[model samples]
Target chain A: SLYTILVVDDSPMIVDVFVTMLERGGYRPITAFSGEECLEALNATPPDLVLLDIMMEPMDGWETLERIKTDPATRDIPVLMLTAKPLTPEEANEYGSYIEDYILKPTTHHQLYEAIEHVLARR
Target chain B: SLYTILVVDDSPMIVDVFVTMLERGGYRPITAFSGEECLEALNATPPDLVLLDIMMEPMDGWETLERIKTDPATRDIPVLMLTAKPLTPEEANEYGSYIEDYILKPTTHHQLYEAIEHVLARR
Candidate 1:
């Protein structure tokens, strides 16, 4: 069966781009518009993994990541962090205890596919 | 641009129902399979709103709501919860303060459409 991915970002352009790429990469893509919407979507359907943005208004990546990783129901899904700003691996690790890994901004589709496959393989 | 929605649920059947209804209502529908996936989807694309489901293997609706409402990036996006069980109007009202609304499962397309539209009207 094809694995599905949940993509969380506040940018419509980014969502469209990621969705197209994920679809082409043989994964079904699910999208949400905000941190709150993301939480709501998660409640409804559990995806195989998540590609998450690090910077967002209001909720910001820090708080969203905190709640997601801290929650028992959501801690297992591996997260590949996406951010426009740069973060050292150590810094990213410090921010999210349960994050599987981190990715730099303007990531290529190939990189995203590889990260997703990597995370899914561990499951 | 047209409004978009993020749908969160673990059930494919439920996702299909919300997607179909939202599309028929002239809105774009995006879906996530779990609360974690829902949050990821939101990060990927900030939707105009969310349609969330309660009752799943791990994350329940209440926990998801607490995270969504508390987040700044996501707090503003309207949430309309979907549930299989019933709740009293008072209970629903409490949830409504956080979410835009809630609906019982097996709801008609018209009901879903109406709820979305009603919430959108408020925005």
Candidate 2:
């Protein structure tokens, strides 16, 4: 079965690459340029999983995640944070509860695909 | 600095692949055929890190990890589990404290090198 993945990132380059990669891997992907856009998409109709980039304008992944986790409508949508560097211990302690996993940036298509497949399969 | 990494696995093919990769990556690798051999190597001279395969002979990575952590001599050595699948949340929390990170089997050489670099750089 095909799973819908919401990919949120500020950089067109990253989002662009991911769009093709996700599509080629036989999954449907929805794109968002910022955390606000991500939240809007989630509100409209939550995808099976969210591939969220941490650094964004005005709103970041954590804030977006906070909104998603706190809201009953989107709380069940699993999230995988795309980060260039790992979160600090304090940030992890704060946000770890809301996320399934965090993938380091420059991740290979296989790893990214498997990660999405993994989270989706578990649920 | 050339760090010594103990690569423990039952497959000679896997160990051979890693030996060349680690050498090319400018690190010294110590190979162990099984968990028993791994413990012996650690007792002789503790490596900076241990890349322990979870699915191995009589003593698995966890048992080897237990031995390493319980001994004051090797307790401080960092470990990275090499596994085919992700650990469940319960298993992750159970063994998470002892590991720097885990690399999914069939990982790319670059990703493997970077995972080691990330853990080493952190400490």
Which number leads on TM-score?
Answer: 2
lDDT, residue B6, model 2: 83
DockQ of each: 0.01, 0.02
Query: Which runs in model 2 stand beyond 4 Å of their true positions?
Result: A1-123, B107-123
Q: What fnat does each of the candidate structures reach? A: 0.00, 0.00
Q: Residues A9-93, candidate 2, lDDT per residue (tens digit)?
A: 9986567555555554456789999988888999886788888898887998888888889989999887878888877888778
- Cα deviation of A48, candidate 1, in Å: 1.1
Q: Which residue pairs in candidate 2 have backbone atoms (N, alpha carbon, C) closer than 3 angstroms, thus clashing?
A: none
lDDT by residue for model 1 over B1-123, one digit each (tens)?
256768788876557655554554456789899888888888789887777787765787778877888888788877767776666788687776786555555422233233323332346
Considering every candidate listed, which one attains the maximal lDDT?
2
Where does model 2 sit among the CAPRI classes?
Answer: incorrect
**Once all C-alphas are superposed, what RMSD does model 2 give against the true structure?**
15.9
